[PDB]
Each structure stands twice: as structure tokens, then as C-alpha cells.
Amino acid sequence: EIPLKYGATNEGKRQDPAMQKFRDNRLGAFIHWGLYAIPGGEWNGKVYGGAAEWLKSWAKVPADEWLKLMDQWNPTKFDAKKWAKMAKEMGTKYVKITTKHHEGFCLWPSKYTKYTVANTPYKRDILGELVKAYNDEGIDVHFYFSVMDWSNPDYRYDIKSKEDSIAFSRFLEFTDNQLKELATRYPTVKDFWFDGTWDASVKKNGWWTAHAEQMLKELVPGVAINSRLRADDKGKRHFDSNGRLMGDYESGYERRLPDPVKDLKVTQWDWEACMTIPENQWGYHKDWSLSYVKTPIEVIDRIVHAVSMGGNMVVNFGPQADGDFRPEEKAMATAIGKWMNRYGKAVYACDYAGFEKQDWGYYTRGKNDEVYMVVFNQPYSERLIVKTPKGITVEKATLLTTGEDITVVETTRNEYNVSVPKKNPGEPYVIQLKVRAAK
Question: Is 405 exposed, middle or buried (0-12, 13-18, 19+ CB in 10 A)?
Fold first, then answer.
């Protein structure tokens, strides 16, 4: 044991109702919207292939010049009720919103900086309008917040002098002021998802990360806080020097989800994956031809994959500068929503089933011992192999959508063939099992 003052605080999963709600929600959307939506990956005639929200860095734009994009911020198509309707129809139970990205532009009218929505042609408190509209649809709101801030000259990437230490202290106070403002202006917030916490300056100030978590939990009863915020006494991030998870859930798995055979460890803690539709664009980029763009079934596979391993999945959107969504994103949301409306019983409030992984897809477990088979890969054998844990038997199989009884044949001591449906469903589909555990 390495002794720590700023390491993990929870032992095991939180089981208070707020955390149960965070978990049971399962499917979220992410909104990345900020000044980067205006250039959309292009600066002075060059389209950069890096993530659009990082364009200030790719194009080496000075802060004053980047922030003058505020003069063009006028999203006349924006309508928070329409955004909330889109999220509702997609089947999302929560939305995570960039309150302030690395650029430092605030989507709420902060009193601690001039680089906010208030000082644009549009003027309006976008964040506040979204909170109200999503909440009116019964959708929880989570806040993304970047610690690293390219607009504040007191930020430091490392501390190499007393002057650096004094500036950075002032920067942390500024950061606390904005966080307290968010927590109090928008008291229905359910989560803070921190980013921009990897620099040496932050790692040397792990105490601040623990303080931020505590401060926010005191202000917002039941709030969740991601692991990415947290550094311990030694600068170790996410999990402390004793291997214990910090914050309330592990944030990670953006590129690649946990392996269903080799990464079962993740079932021991809450976790949340966030995903882009293109390979690596979070903010609006005008050219999606530059990388692979996932199809709706590919996304749905990832959503179910996460739930099957006890995690949440969040699908990212990068709204246009005008305040509408691009056609690919409207199509995505609509397709997901159609599938979730049919099959969402196997997603919402579901978790890891404790069954050996099979090639046809994923198992999920409901709150009343329902075991769902979510089939993505249809066997030419017309048989879906089910190997049960010790003491577990399959009593019935039912096609979720129609109630069709599905034949179950015992093939060996711990294995069955569950028949595919009489008619190929033509899309990923669910068979619900009734199982019994030996007394």
C-alpha cells in the first residue's frame, strides 16, 4: 500500500439512487459545440485532418484571433426544444454537453470571463436553454468541462518557476469559480465529465482534483464525477497508485471497447464509453470523407457491447455552426431510435449476464433475471449456441418483438442450441430467455 491523501474515495460501485439512475440510463448522447464549429476544420484555405475542435492548435492560431470567432457566433437555426426532441426520439436517457472546451469559449454566460455566449451576436444562454429543454423531456444533463483552457494566460502546462506556481494557483481559483457557477446556475446537473487534465501541471496538483470532486459533490447532491478528472499524490491518473478507481466511474474506451473475453475486470466498476461517428472528430468537421464513418448497426453493436459488460455508451454529435445537425447525424439518431424503440428492453436498466461470450452477439441481463440474446451475426447453422453457467438452465426462449416461442434443444451437459426465428428478422434482434438457478 502506497499511502495517499488524494487517491480513491469509493470502495466498489455507488448504489445510491442517483448512481443507479446514471447506470440504468445506459444510452446517452454527447454534444460538442463551440467556436470550432464555425471553421469546421478549415483555416485560411487548408482543411486539416486532425479533430476539428483542436483546429486552434493544428493551424497555430493565436488566442485573440481564434476567439474573434465569437463575432460569427449566430446559430439562428438553434432550437433547444428541437434538440431535446431529437434526443428523445433517438432513445437517449441523458445528454452530455461541452460547457467549455479547450478553446475556453463558454456556452453559458460566465461572469469570470469575457469569452462567452453573452458576448456574441446571439447573446443567449445556450447551456441554460438546453438544460431546460432536455429536462422537460425527462432527459438527464451531464456537463463536459475542460480544465486546460487556451483562452486564460494563467494556464500552465508545467510548473517550472515560482511565477508559474502563482499563476497556476490563480488559474485553479478561476476554474473553481466557473465550476461553482455551473453547479449553482444549473442545479439539475447529474454529472461532471472532465477533460484537459493530463498536463504535468495538473498531475503535480492531484490535491486540486480531489478538491474539485469534493466541492462539486457538496454543491450537487448525488452528482457523478468521471475518473479522467482525477490524479493522486503521485500524479497517477484515473486509477490511483494502489490501482483503485478514482471518481465514480471509469471514463475511457473511446477508440476501442473492453474485450468481451479478456476484459471482464470492467464489470467490477461503473464505466462509460464515449464514441465519435467518424474515427476521430468530436466537433463539427466539414469533411467526413477523410476517415471511416460508422453505420447505425455498427453503433448499435457498440451500445449493446457496452451494456453487456456493465457499461454505458454515449454517441457523439457535433452540431453545425447554424445550430442544426448535419444529415448523417439526423439519420444516425433516427435509426438508433427506431431500433431502441423495438429492442430497448435489452438495453435500458440492463447489465452483465455472467455467461460465456458467443459469436452470434451479446447477452444482457434485466432487473428481474431476464437474460437477453442480442443477435448481430446470424449463424448459417440456424442455431444459436448457449452455454450456461453451473446450475443454470434455460426454460424458455421467446422472440422479444412478437412473443414467438423459440425452440431450445439441449446438446451437451451445459449447452443448448436456441433456434433462430422462423423468419429472419433482417436486423439485429433479441431473444429473451427464462432461466432458472438450481437451489
Answer: exposed
Cell 503535480 maps to which residue? Answer: 204
Cβ-count burial of 138 within 10 angstroms (0-12 exposed, 13-18 middle, 19+ buried)? exposed
At a CB cut-off of 8 Å and minimum separation 6, what does 106 contact?
99, 100, 113, 115, 116, 117, 178
The β-bridge partners of 201 are none
Closest alpha carbon to 283 in 28, 39, 70, 69: 39
Q: Domain range for residue 353?
A: 349-437
Q: How far is CA 114 from the centre of its chain?
A: 29
Q: How was this structure determined?
A: X-ray
281 and 379 share a domain?
no
Classify each residue of 204-214 as buried b or exposed e, where b means 16 or more C-beta atoms within 10 Å of its C-beta.
bbbebbbebbe
Same domain for 292 and 234, yes or no, is yes
Compute, in degrees rounded to 10, the torsion defined by CA atoms 213, 219, 225, 231: -10
Q: Is 417 exposed, middle or buried (0-12, 13-18, 19+ CB in 10 A)?
A: middle
CB 341 within 8 A of CB 334: no
